[PDB]
Amino acid sequence: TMSLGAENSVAYSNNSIAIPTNFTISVTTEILPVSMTKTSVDCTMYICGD
Amino acid sequence: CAQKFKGLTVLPPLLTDEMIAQYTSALLAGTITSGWTFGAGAALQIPFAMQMAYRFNGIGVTQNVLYENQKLIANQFNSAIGKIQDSLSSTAS
Amino acid sequence: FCGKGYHLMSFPQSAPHGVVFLHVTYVPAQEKNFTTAPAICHDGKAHFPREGVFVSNGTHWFVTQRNFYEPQIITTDNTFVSGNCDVVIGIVNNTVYDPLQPELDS
Ligand SMILES: *[C@@H]1O[C@H](CO)[C@@H](O[C@@H]2O[C@H](CO)[C@@H](O[C@@H]3O[C@H](CO)[C@@H](O)[C@H](O)[C@@H]3O)[C@H](O)[C@H]2NC(C)=O)[C@H](O)[C@H]1NC(C)=O
Ligand SMILES: *[C@@H]1O[C@H](CO)[C@@H](O[C@@H]2O[C@H](CO)[C@@H](O)[C@H](O)[C@H]2NC(C)=O)[C@H](O)[C@H]1NC(C)=O
Ligand SMILES: *[C@@H]1O[C@H](CO)[C@@H](O[C@@H]2O[C@H](CO)[C@@H](O)[C@H](O)[C@H]2NC(C)=O)[C@H](O)[C@H]1NC(C)=O
Ligand SMILES: *[C@@H]1O[C@H](CO)[C@@H](O)[C@H](O)[C@H]1NC(C)=O
Ligand SMILES: *[C@@H]1O[C@H](CO)[C@@H](O)[C@H](O)[C@H]1NC(C)=O
């Protein structure tokens, strides 16, 4: 059976807050199609040639 | 049963109805206990009143308004949530 | 939308029958426990931060930005006054330093 992910629990409280003290720079890619191949068909020859 | 035969079948979905509920519950818990920080990295806890005050500050209203009308806002939210059940339970789906 | 995290900038690249993006993002790390309060009462008045949060180093109190740990002394230029000290739930007694009267008293 597939696993959804790792279990976690946030330490919520009446008066508690967390502030980061350091940062990381991340670079990610992303691929998107734009165009495909252009084609043309000769119907008269394809239906019956010669 | 369910028409069947003649080579017409129905394939069950990959994700059952329990995994989706687990995902939605996790999302709700994260939104409640972290705000919007869990969508960009590690989840950071913060009191709910402060998160709502910052959300008010994000739309051009100073944060003291919530700290003065917290009870009224909570009552309005509770009543609005309560009305949704009656709205959905009606036959006019 | 433009990458995962806080977007900074992007650079395009060409691919056959397509296009490739490179997203630069800002990701926080290394959080720490802290104690927070919604408001601070000094002289029967409620003080709220301008663009920060209230943090406590166990004993003292500071104000810092929400995305980076940078403590500062709570002054009258960091907070604004509105109301009294009997309507906000969770208010904490403290002192606010005035950066004008004590030194520039001449
Ligand atoms: C914030 O995080 C950065 C990393 O993203 C920290 O920089 C890294 O600091 C460690 C030590 O704390 C460096 O490791 C050691 O560096 C010395 C000096 O070059 C080297 O001789 C050792 O062999 C070891 O590698 C690490 O190199 C350094 N990373 C970079 C890219 O410079 C930074 O210290 C953190 N700042 C705070 C305030 O936590
Ligand atoms: C939390 O931060 C305060 C602010 O510096 C620390 O205060 C100490 O006491 C006085 C305040 O200026 C200084 O003479 C000490 O040098 C401070 N200690 C430092 C800077 O390490 C306080 O010690 C910090 N920790 C706790 C648990 O309160
Ligand atoms: C914060 O300061 C206020 C005002 O100084 C305190 O309110 C006083 O509380 C005492 C009891 O400890 C009463 O006898 C006084 O009548 C209150 N008012 C004044 C003007 O002194 C308050 O107790 C302090 N602490 C907190 C947590 O609010
Ligand atoms: C937070 O404070 C409220 C009001 O004092 C209290 O009812 C609640 O139990 C507290 N939550 C805790 C201590 O986890
Ligand atoms: C903050 O402290 C509590 C109890 O002292 C602890 O359970 C929690 O893990 C701490 N936070 C972090 C980020 O470690």
Q: Which residue has the tokens 């059976």?
A: A1
C52 near B53, Cβ under 8 Å?
no
Two tokens, residue A38: 């252009």
End-to-end CA distance of chain B: 29
Q: Which residue has the tokens 């009258």?
A: C76
Using an 8 Å CB-CB cutoff, list chain C residues near B44.
31
How many cross-chain Cβ pairs, A to B, lie less than 8 Å apart? 31
Neighbouring chains of C at 3+ CB pairs under 8 Å are A, B
Long-range contacts of C63-68 (CB under 8 A, 24+ apart): C64/A19, C66/A19, C66/B54, C67/A20, C67/C28, C68/A19, C68/A20, C68/A21, C68/A23
C78 near C52, Cβ under 8 Å?
yes
Q: Is the dihedral of CA B19, B20, B25, B31 positive or negative?
A: positive
A47 CA to chain C: closest CA distance, Å?
31
- Report the C-alpha gap between C63 and A16 in whole angstroms: 15
Do the chains contact at A4 and B47, CB–CB below 8 Å?
A: no
Two tokens, residue B11: 């394939």
B45 near A16, Cβ under 8 Å?
yes
Do the chains contact at C89 and B44, CB–CB below 8 Å?
A: no
Nearest by CB to residue C69, choosing from A19, A33, A34, is: A19
- Report the C-alpha gap between A1 and A48 in whole angstroms: 55
C40 CA to chain B: closest CA distance, Å?
12
Element (H, E) at B67: helix B64-89
Two tokens, residue C64: 């810092």
Per the DSSP assignment, residues forming a β-bridge with C9 are C24
Do the chains contact at B41 and C29, CB–CB below 8 Å?
A: yes
Name the residue in chain C with its Cα closest to that of B51: C38
Name the residue in chain C with its Cα closest to that of B38: C5
Long-range contacts of C59-66 (CB under 8 A, 24+ apart): C61/C37, C61/C92, C61/C94, C64/A19, C66/A19, C66/B54
The CB of C75 under 6 Å from ligand 2? The reply is no
CA A14 / ligand 4 centre spacing (Å): 6
C6 CB near a chain A CB, below 8 Å?
A: no
Concatenating the DSSP letter of every residue in C22-87 gives EEEEEEEE---EEB--S-EESSS-EEEESS-EEEE-SSSEEEE-SSS---B--BTTTEEE-S-SSS
| Burial per residue of A9-34, b for 16 or more beta-carbon CB atoms within 10 angstroms, e otherwise | ebeeeeeebbbbeeeeebeeeeeeee
The CB of A26 under 6 Å from ligand 1? The reply is no
State how beta strands C92-93 and C40-41 pair: parallel
Question: Of chain C residues 60-99, which have a CB less than 8 A from chain A?
Answer: 64, 66-69, 90
Q: How many residues are listed for chain C in this entry?
A: 106
The CB of C60 under 6 Å from ligand 2? The reply is yes
